[PDB]
Amino acid sequence: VLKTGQSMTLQCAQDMNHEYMSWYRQDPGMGLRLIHYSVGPNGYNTTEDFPLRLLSAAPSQTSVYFCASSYVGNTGELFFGEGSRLTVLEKNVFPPEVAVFEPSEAEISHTQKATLVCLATGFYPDHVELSWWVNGKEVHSGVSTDKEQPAYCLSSRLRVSATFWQNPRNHFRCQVQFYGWTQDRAKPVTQIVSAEAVLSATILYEILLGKATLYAVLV
Amino acid sequence: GNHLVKVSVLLTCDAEAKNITWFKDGKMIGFLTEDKKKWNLGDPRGMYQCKGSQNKSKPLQVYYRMCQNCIELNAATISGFLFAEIVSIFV
Amino acid sequence: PYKVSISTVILTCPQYPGSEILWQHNDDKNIGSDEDHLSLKEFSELEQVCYPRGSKPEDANFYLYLRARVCENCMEMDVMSVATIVIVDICITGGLLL
Amino acid sequence: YKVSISTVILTCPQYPGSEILWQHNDKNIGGDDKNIGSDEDHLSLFSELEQSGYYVCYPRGSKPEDANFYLYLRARVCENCMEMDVMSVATIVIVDICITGG
Amino acid sequence: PIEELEDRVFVNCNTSITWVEGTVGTLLSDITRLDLGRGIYRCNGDKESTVQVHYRMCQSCVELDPATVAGIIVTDVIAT
Amino acid sequence: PAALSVPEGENLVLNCSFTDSAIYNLQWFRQDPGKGLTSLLLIQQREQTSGRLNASLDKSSGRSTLYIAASQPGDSATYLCASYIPTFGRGTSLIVHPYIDPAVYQLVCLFTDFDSQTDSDVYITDKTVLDMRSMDFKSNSAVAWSNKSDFACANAFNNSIIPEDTFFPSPESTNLNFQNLSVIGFRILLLKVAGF
Amino acid sequence: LCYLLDGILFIYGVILTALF
Amino acid sequence: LCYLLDGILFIYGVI
Numbered sequence: 001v002l003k004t005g006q007s008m009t010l011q012c013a014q015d016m017n018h019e020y021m022s023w024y025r026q027d028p029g030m031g032l033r034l035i036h037y038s039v040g041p042n043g044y045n046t047t048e049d050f051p052l053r054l055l056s057a058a059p060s061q062t063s064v065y066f067c068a069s070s071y072v073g074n075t076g077e078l079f080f081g082e083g084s085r086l087t088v089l090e091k092n093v094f095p096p097e098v099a100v101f102e103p104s105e106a107e108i109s110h111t112q113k114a115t116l117v118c119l120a121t122g123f124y125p126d127h128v129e130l131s132w133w134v135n136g137k138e139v140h141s142g143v144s145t146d147k148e149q150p151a152y153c154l155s156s157r158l159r160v161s162a163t164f165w166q167n168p169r170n171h172f173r174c175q176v177q178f179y180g181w182t183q184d185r186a187k188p189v190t191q192i193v194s195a196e197a198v199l200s201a202t203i204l205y206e207i208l209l210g211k212a213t214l215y216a217v218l219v
Numbered sequence: 220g221n222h223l224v225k226v227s228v229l230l231t232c233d234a235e236a237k238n239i240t241w242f243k244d245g246k247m248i249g250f251l252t253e254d255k256k257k258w259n260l261g262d263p264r265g266m267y268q269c270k271g272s273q274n275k276s277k278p279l280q281v282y283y284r285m286c287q288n289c290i291e292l293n294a295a296t297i298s299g300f301l302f303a304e305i306v307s308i309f310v
Numbered sequence: 311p312y313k314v315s316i317s318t319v320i321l322t323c324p325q326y327p328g329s330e331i332l333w334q335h336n337d338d339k340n341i342g343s344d345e346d347h348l349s350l351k352e353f354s355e356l357e358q359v360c361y362p363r364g365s366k367p368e369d370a371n372f373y374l375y376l377r378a379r380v381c382e383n384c385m386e387m388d389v390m391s392v393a394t395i396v397i398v399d400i401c402i403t404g405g406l407l408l
Numbered sequence: 409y410k411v412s413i414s415t416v417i418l419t420c421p422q423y424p425g426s427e428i429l430w431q432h433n434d435k436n437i438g439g440d441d442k443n444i445g446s447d448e449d450h451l452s453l454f455s456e457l458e459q460s461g462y463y464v465c466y467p468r469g470s471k472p473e474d475a476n477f478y479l480y481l482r483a484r485v486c487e488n489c490m491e492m493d494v495m496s497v498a499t500i501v502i503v504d505i506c507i508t509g510g
Numbered sequence: 511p512i513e514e515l516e517d518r519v520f521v522n523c524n525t526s527i528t529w530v531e532g533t534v535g536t537l538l539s540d541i542t543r544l545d546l547g548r549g550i551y552r553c554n555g556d557k558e559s560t561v562q563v564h565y566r567m568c569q570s571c572v573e574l575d576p577a578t579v580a581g582i583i584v585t586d587v588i589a590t
Numbered sequence: 591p592a593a594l595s596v597p598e599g600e601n602l603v604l605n606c607s608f609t610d611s612a613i614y615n616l617q618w619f620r621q622d623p624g625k626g627l628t629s630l631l632l633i634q635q636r637e638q639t640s641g642r643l644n645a646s647l648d649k650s651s652g653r654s655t656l657y658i659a660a661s662q663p664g665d666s667a668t669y670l671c672a673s674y675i676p677t678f679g680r681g682t683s684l685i686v687h688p689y690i691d692p693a694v695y696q697l698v699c700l701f702t703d704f705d706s707q708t709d710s711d712v713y714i715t716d717k718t719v720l721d722m723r724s725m726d727f728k729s730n731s732a733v734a735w736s737n738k739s740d741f742a743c744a745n746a747f748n749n750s751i752i753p754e755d756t757f758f759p760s761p762e763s764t765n766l767n768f769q770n771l772s773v774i775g776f777r778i779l780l781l782k783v784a785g786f
Numbered sequence: 787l788c789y790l791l792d793g794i795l796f797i798y799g800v801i802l803t804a805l806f
Numbered sequence: 807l808c809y810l811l812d813g814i815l816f817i818y819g820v821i
């Protein structure tokens with residue numbers, strides 16, 4: 001989380017002799033930008049380490065960052081970073097809150113395939129945008145994502161089978177992330193902000209292992 | 220700086236190499252090699268720290284509560300509780 | 311080194327002697343406590359370190375990981391608390407036979 | 409392959425007049441620590457995702473392009489656990505009726 | 511290679527798959543791919559690639575510990 | 591083309607445009623929201639084929655063309671064309687109709703399965719399709735979110751053209767990791783309490 | 787879900803035992 | 807998973 005005037009560092013690295021590294025920027029919906037690099041540029045500041053540093057108060061970032069790394073002289077296959085997104089916030093500072101919407105039983109009764117949607121509660125300004133995660137292991141199949149009061153838009157959707165969503169397991173960790181003070185609220189950086197989505201059967205079973213202990217105690 | 224101890228029940232000590240030694244509550248409990256980057260529980264409810272640098276590193280405290288449900292006396296959970304309990308101790 | 315108190319359930323943050331105690335949570339009316347106590351009511355599994363008066367939070371070297379429930383008029387849930395759950399079972403069979 | 413765990417045991421088919429050596433998950437495997445050891449017929453290992461992958465035996469020199477046969481053996485194998493293969497619960501039931509029989 | 515995706519296990523091949531005795535699955539809408547709920551399936555890149563597969567993490571299994579192994583033996587002997 | 595929607599199994603024509611010849615890089619990318627760009631060609635060779643893929647080249651013309659045989663909902667993503675920076679020549683956005691159902695559910699009212707052709711307290715999302723690989727059956731969908739004025743799905747999609755037979759039940763209608771296997775395991779001690 | 791039928795057959799087992 | 811329990815006791819309990 002970057003409050004205005006602060007500094008943020010995000011790192012990229014390679015270990016298989018990529019002689020060229022670059023940082024890419026993507027404005028979600030209509031923009032794609034390139035960030036200057038130095039293996040041996042506005043609003044942003046060794047061959048195995050690749051740092052990205054913020055040393056300006058520019059509020060117009062409002063984008064997603066990608067890291068680049070590839071060989072030179074061969075066919076030229078490109079390898080890209082997963083992504084990174086930042087923050088701009090001029091007390092009044094508030095990171096948008098994300099929420100989870102589970103499917104109902106009607107969808108699985110009719111079509112027998114589920115659909116998961118998670119939402120981030122919006123505000124007048126912007127700079128919140130990228131995708132989400134799941135089960136502490138990023139699944140890369142069937143993933144889909146993406147006015148107001150004059151005091152951006154991003155909702156993700158997943159196609160799921162009826163036998164796939166049923167569990168609390170297959171845990172959907174919805175988070176669009178500002179990666180990373182005189183207000184009663186905690187510091188803006190805080191941590192990963194996420195809304196999380198039968199295991200209660202397992203918990204009940206571990207509970208009646210209590211009875212499994214009563215039996216041994218009695219005998 | 221530091222903060223090299225991070226927490227599918229996995230415990231990690233990143234940025235280290237060669238012998239990694241695991242300390243649970245300050246005592247020698249586990250050896251980790253170069254090719255392995257993870258340590259697993261097998262509720263951890265323990266106090267842990269990792270030694271790859273001089274006198275270990277910044278320690279971490281962990282403990283886990285099983286029921287992700289059980290916000291309050293939830294009706295479904297309460298029903299499961301009362302049925303299972305009544306049968307189990309009437310026998 | 312963080313220990314809890316049983317009562318509203320309270321999480322405590324013992325620290326070195328400091329003229330002022332500061333917290334960093336991970337207009338909410340549920341965020342309220344006294345002394346070195348910390349209490350959460352209607353706790354959420356969403357985004358929802360503590361050090362004495364100082365310059366940076368890095369002085370409180372020990373960090374904490376927590377995934378639990380803080381509630382009111384609720385029994386404690388822990389590995390040993392299954393024995394408390396054990397206690398309520400043979401208590402309620404005592405209630406039933408009487 | 410016939411696999412049992414007591415340390416797990418791997419089975420590689422014997423070959424006429426051929427040396428024996430192993431490769432695991434496209435990386436080399438000893439036979440370095442106590443868990444890894446293999447000298448006569450079998451390869452001994454298991455820890456979840458890290459050691460899950462391809463397990464096969466290789467010859468000297470012509471490896472690895474010659475071998476079109478590769479086993480994809482991904483496992484969890486918790487430390488000190490039970491040999492149990494998907495449908496082998498009845499076999500696991502077979503074990504304890506034997507105990508009940510005696 | 512073969513892949514694990516969502517609910518069921520799958521066998522991936524760039525060409526048609528031929529099945530050797532084992533747990534019989536079902537053919538997917540893609541002729542070159544197969545689905546599972548072991549068997550050896552030949553594949554081509556030409557070169558021929560043969561893959562023998564058997565998987566260990568179960569939608570139906572049992573795993574436990576030697577102390578819990580002691581528990582299970584105690585239970586079945588006094589359940590005799 | 592534009593975000594063209596096509597039925598399953600059609601032959602494709604997706605084009606690039608470039609005005610430079612001093613380059614050695616030509617590859618194709620499938621884009622996911624949170625997965626970046628993954629490269630899917632080797633034409634840096636004018637006709638390379640790898641499964642469902644085919645491509646054609648004309649450096650004289652200044653335009654590249656790709657062909658997909660039996661395009662699937664996996665093609666429902668933006669397709670891109672490869673200083674050494676990946677100068678994306680033209681690019682193209684694509685969506686594929688998994689034609690053979692329509693129904694709106696309440697979760698956040700979820701319009702889905704239309705398969706064709708489809709004031710501030712209610713917010714809606716656009717039409718999407720995506721590769722469902724498990725059972726290889728897909729579905730288009732859209733979700734309407736609102737909290738104010740107690741919205742209902744029927745009036746929420748009063749702007750949208752719900753298909754003629756949209757199912758509207760508005761007021762009505764894998765284990766892993768040890769402990770489940772233990773549940774499969776300790777039924778012995780679970781049951782032997784009988785008589786005891 | 788299969789656990790709810792684990793119940794349904796658990797009541798099946800208890801009516802079995804009651805008949806026994 | 808419920809065949810563990812349907813396997814014998816259901817068919818034994820129906821008759």
Ligand SMILES: *[C@@H]1O[C@H](CO)[C@@H](O[C@@H]2O[C@H](CO)[C@@H](O[C@@H]3O[C@H](CO)[C@@H](O)[C@H](O)[C@@H]3O)[C@H](O)[C@H]2NC(C)=O)[C@H](O)[C@H]1NC(C)=O
Binds near residue numbers: 238
């Ligand atoms: C890395 O960690 C392993 C953990 O097992 C070390 O193995 C054990 O290392 C100890 C010493 O740390 C060995 O004891 C004795 O060490 C000294 C060496 O000066 C000497 O008195 C003896 O020759 C003996 O080696 C012990 O044998 C060994 N035990 C086992 C079960 O492996 C390993 O040495 C460590 N590597 C290092 C510190 O470079």
Ligand SMILES: CC(C)CCC[C@@H](C)[C@H]1CC[C@H]2[C@@H]3CC=C4C[C@@H](O)CC[C@]4(C)[C@H]3CC[C@]12C
Binds near residue numbers: 198201302
């Ligand atoms: C061996 C077992 C079956 C013991 C018998 C007790 C039965 C009645 C218990 C055990 C497991 C229980 C289930 C465990 C988990 C859940 C999920 C929860 O959200 C609703 C209740 C529900 C679906 C329970 C219903 C009652 C249940 C089936």
Ligand SMILES: CC(C)CCC[C@@H](C)[C@H]1CC[C@H]2[C@@H]3CC=C4C[C@@H](O)CC[C@]4(C)[C@H]3CC[C@]12C
Binds near residue numbers: 306
């Ligand atoms: C799943 C955990 C709790 C293991 C314990 C299994 C318990 C719940 C099972 C095993 C033995 C069972 C009992 C065996 C005998 C009878 C007598 C019959 O006329 C009514 C049911 C009743 C009273 C059963 C109720 C359920 C029961 C108590």
Ligand SMILES: *[C@@H]1O[C@H](CO)[C@@H](O)[C@H](O)[C@H]1NC(C)=O
Binds near residue numbers: 273274
């Ligand atoms: C290292 O040494 C000092 C002095 O012994 C000690 O106070 C400090 O806590 C140690 N560092 C750790 C344990 O991380």
